[PDB]
């Protein structure tokens, strides 16, 4: 949890323009959040990047979790190993609004972060799930009460977020 170069937006939300994979390898936080789908198939986006950085160990472990427990619900989560990235990986499913899933479930997705005092995380439902990333940051700020360090890869998006929030 030795985070560096973050900008404090609220009492508990910090943001950096950084690749979440590089942040996790540098900091080795207690918890790294994955933006997952209900079957934990880490095919692209943040999920594909985190799985690739574990050389598919996250995917093998995720397939075993699904075989024994069944899929997650949208808005739900599970805690699995963080492998070489963190002590734990909190896989969280935000709604895929491009497929009609309710945007109200973005609040339930971010409520899962409150179970952990400190987390390294990406924005949920941004990217291929189609939610507006500034709206996703607003829900994070209104919902998360524990300390969250958000890593945002895209510099153009990072600048837009910092201007809208402060």
Ligand X SMILES: O=C(O)[C@@H]1CCC[C@H]1c1ccc2ncccc2c1
Q: CB of residue 76 vs ligand X: minimum separation in angstroms?
A: 19
| 91 closest CA partner among 128, 55, 66, 117 | 66
Site for ligand X in 118-157 (CB under 6 A): 122-123, 126-127, 133, 152-154, 157
Task: Out of 36, 46, 140, 161, name the contact with ligand X by CB under 6 A.
Answer: 46
Stretch near ligand X under the rule CB under 6 A, chosen from 3-11, 41-49, 89-97, 100-108:
41-49
Token readout for 127 is: 């990217």
Closest contact distance (angstroms) between CB of 19 and ligand X is 5
CB of 153 to ligand X, least distance (A): 4
**What does the DSSP assignment read for 62-93?**
HHHHHHHH-PPPTT-EEEEE-TTT-SEEEEE-
Structure tokens at 81: 């190993």
Query: Please, is 69 exposed, middle or buried when counting C-beta atoms within 10 Å of its C-beta (0-12, 13-18, 19+)?
Result: exposed
Q: How far is 119 from 88, CA to CA, in rounded Å?
A: 10
Sole window of 15-23, 26-34, 79-87, 90-98 interacting with ligand X (rule: CB under 6 A) = 15-23
Residue 19 or 111: the one with the smaller Cβ distance to ligand X is 19
Beta strands per DSSP E along the chain: 7-8, 13-17, 31-35, 77-81, 88-92, 118-121, 147-152
Q: Is 9 in the site for ligand X (CB under 6 A)?
A: no
Q: Would you count residue 45 as binding ligand X (CB under 6 A)?
A: yes
Site string for ligand X, 87-116 (x = CB under 6 A): ------------------------------
**DSSP type of residue 18:** S
Nearer to ligand X, 25 or 69 (CB): 25
Q: Which residues bind ligand X (CB under 6 A)?
A: 19-21, 45-46, 49, 122-123, 126-127, 133, 152-154, 157
């Amino acid at each position: 949890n030795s985070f560096s170069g973050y900008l404090k937006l609220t009492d508990n939300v910090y943001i950096k323009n950084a690749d979440i994979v590089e942040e996790a390898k540098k900091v080795k936080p207690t918890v790294v959040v994955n933006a997952a789908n209900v079957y934990l198939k880490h095919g692209g986006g943040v999920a594909g990047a985190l799985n690739k950085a574990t050389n598919n160990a996250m995917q093998v472990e995720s397939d075993d979790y699904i075989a024994t427990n069944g899929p997650l619900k949208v808005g739900g989560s599970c805690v699995l190993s963080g492998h070489n990235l963190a002590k734990h990986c909190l896989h969280v499913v935000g709604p895929n609004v491009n497929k009609g899933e309710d945007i109200q479930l973005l609040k339930s997705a971010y409520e899962n972060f409150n179970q952990h005092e400190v987390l390294l995380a990406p924005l949920l439902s941004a990217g291929i799930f189609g939610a507006d990333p500034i709206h996703s940051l607003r829900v994070c700020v209104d919902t998360v009460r524990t300390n969250v360090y958000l890593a945002v890869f895209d510099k153009n998006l990072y600048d837009k977020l910092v201007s809208s929030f402060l």
